[PDB]
Subunit: 438 residues, 2 copies
Amino acid sequence: YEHTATIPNVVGFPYKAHIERNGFSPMTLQLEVVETSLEPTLNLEYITCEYKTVVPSPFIKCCGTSECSSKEQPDYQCKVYTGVYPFMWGGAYCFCDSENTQLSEAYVDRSDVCKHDHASAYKAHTASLKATIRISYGTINQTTEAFVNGEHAVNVGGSKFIFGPISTAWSPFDNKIVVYKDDVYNQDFPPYGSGQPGRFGDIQSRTVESKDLYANTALKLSRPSPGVVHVPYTQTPSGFKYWLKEKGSSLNTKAPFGCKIKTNPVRAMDCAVGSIPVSMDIPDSAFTRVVDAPAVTDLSCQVVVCTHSSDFGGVATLSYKTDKPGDCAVHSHSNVATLQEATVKVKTAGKVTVHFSTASASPAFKVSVCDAKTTCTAACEPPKDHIVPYGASHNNQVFPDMSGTAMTWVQRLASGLGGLALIAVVVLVLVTCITMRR
Amino acid sequence: YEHTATIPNVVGFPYKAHIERNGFSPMTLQLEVVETSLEPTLNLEYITCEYKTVVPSPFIKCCGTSECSSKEQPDYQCKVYTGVYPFMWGGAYCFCDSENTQLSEAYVDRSDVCKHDHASAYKAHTASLKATIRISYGTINQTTEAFVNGEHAVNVGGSKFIFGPISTAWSPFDNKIVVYKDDVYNQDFPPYGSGQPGRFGDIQSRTVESKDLYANTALKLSRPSPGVVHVPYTQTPSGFKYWLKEKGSSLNTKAPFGCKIKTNPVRAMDCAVGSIPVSMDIPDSAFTRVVDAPAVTDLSCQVVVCTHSSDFGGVATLSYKTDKPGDCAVHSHSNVATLQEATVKVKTAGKVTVHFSTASASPAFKVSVCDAKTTCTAACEPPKDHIVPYGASHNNQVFPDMSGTAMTWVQRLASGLGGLALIAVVVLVLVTCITMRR
């Protein structure tokens, strides 16, 4: 039996889907989203980490000269300084007072811990949503993971569910992402081969292991101080070690819709956005036949108390006649007010209670109990507590029923002025017939 | 020096970009695409392979009976058959003539070679070009791999190049892809958990190594023949071993634009589609100053021969008056004809020859040598050979020059009829003037 629903993508909000069927007593399923995991597809652009600057001992050539030569190493600098006369602890290092040259050499390399302390610049796109749904109905009460697309049928109790395409493609990850340990950053990182000194990605590596490193750290050698051996040099400090303090708080503290951001893999958990279609194929063995169910009749509804609070702040008492005791599926056919319980034990004592949640000062909604249907109506007070630690169980529909007091006054006004306008029309049509004839 | 070009995404077409600059003698770069690799992002949906049907020996209980149990194994079938009376080679297996049962049991498993002989169903999206470009100018003559987006500067000879976003996002891979060894198949494979018996994906596994296997092979047990031990059963033949003979030929034989399709990773090589923007940042050290270049003057052209064949079928000798010998850059400013050589050795002998490829019956194009410019004009014959093993070196622009013989005849006809029409208009207007005076 194919049935379709559309549940909110709201975690821990148990949606009730009501399946009325021809030969069988109606069935209510609960569909509660236990988790979701919106996971982007990632392309690694490059790895960044602190640089190491490699500065050998100066090749001081006493009484001679020592030409420099190029090398392939990143940001490599080499210069030969003529006319040095350096001292060591025991005296001058060279015999010649001026015919000496110091070869100074320095270059940049990936740090020794870059395998362990690095940030990955990713492009992030085409997110796929996996949800954990709890399905329950009758004896079946089971939790199953499903990919939220029109293309993964998951078995529950012999039923197959397809959780159709998520209503919106939205995701909190921008097109460019930086990932670092537990944290994710929306960050327009500099393209590979164009990173700049003292900013994130001043050195860049296409992978943690890659032999080829882009480095642009503005390393410049300068001439050694007179009589001093030290290979002096200036270089712009590590842009990664600037980023680590400049980061701010990560996307986990900033994502919309209450998303909780996690890494390994990069995913946005529990984003309370959109709605999930469901296709439900329920077998006949799930239902009970109308010959088995109680013949609930003359169902009526009285609301004992109602508060339009965020929890199940209203209490209905349902009263009826029945031929036998037994379970009945119970539902509210209006989003004005949702019900706490999916099923009720109908008993020959002829009365039942059902708890409901609404956002409106005067709801009206058609409850059913098995085949029987009735209209509940209430006067609902506002709550006293301004703020609560839980989300609404209602659908936030606030427009009052036309039988409510506000709409009653509106009806009395509009029928008063309309009746006066009708009398004015009657008078004018009467007179204008006379002035047509005469 | 920021400069921009746009090269055809045609492998081995040696596009030549001409830089004209105020302080410096002009420069022609070659930009030859050696390879492209259009690689889709792949999400693995599931693994398919031939199933192994596991059928234990029949548990025949003599003089007794057996219950049986459901097991959480794929496609698992079990039935107990009452009243068996089997014969082994030496006689009846059981004493009792009807108080016996055979427990027949069978289930589906993944085949033992599914680690090796399996097909992986992927979704393919947001393909990224990588291209191998050969850059040459002067003594710099070098090959660099670049990602073709506006976001990867590569250094050649101290010059940055950015190969901008490919003009079209086309790729030969459909949204759903099946990969098998060297082959890629465009194939709408069945969603996971919905594969059907005897067709591709009758068994499905989310990964090669996963513990959980979907199976839907229509395995059914049937009663053992009287007096025979054999566990009879029917099952639909492996949908993967049907697919292997039904595949046909892979996307490698069918992709548009001449794409060559390869795996590990899935990539479409050398697709001849679109054009690649280029940004150049050439340093001044690459140029030569106009004080150093030849002062080429009195440049004039005659075309010694021209066939508008797919190769460089035209030859144009350039007569010039220099002041010194030197290397001059040479370029053709009109895309009706592409030159073969980017530079020419200017000699005091005052003549040299240049080869060009054209597709039109009569091109005219502004050749330049250093600063000097002249218009070459030709009358080009068609080639004799109907088919050639190589692509056109020209841009396939075929409209003739307005000074060509066809357009000369059109100009004669159109100016003759236009002149006669103007004379008729003048006669009419003059007659209207005279009859206005009268």
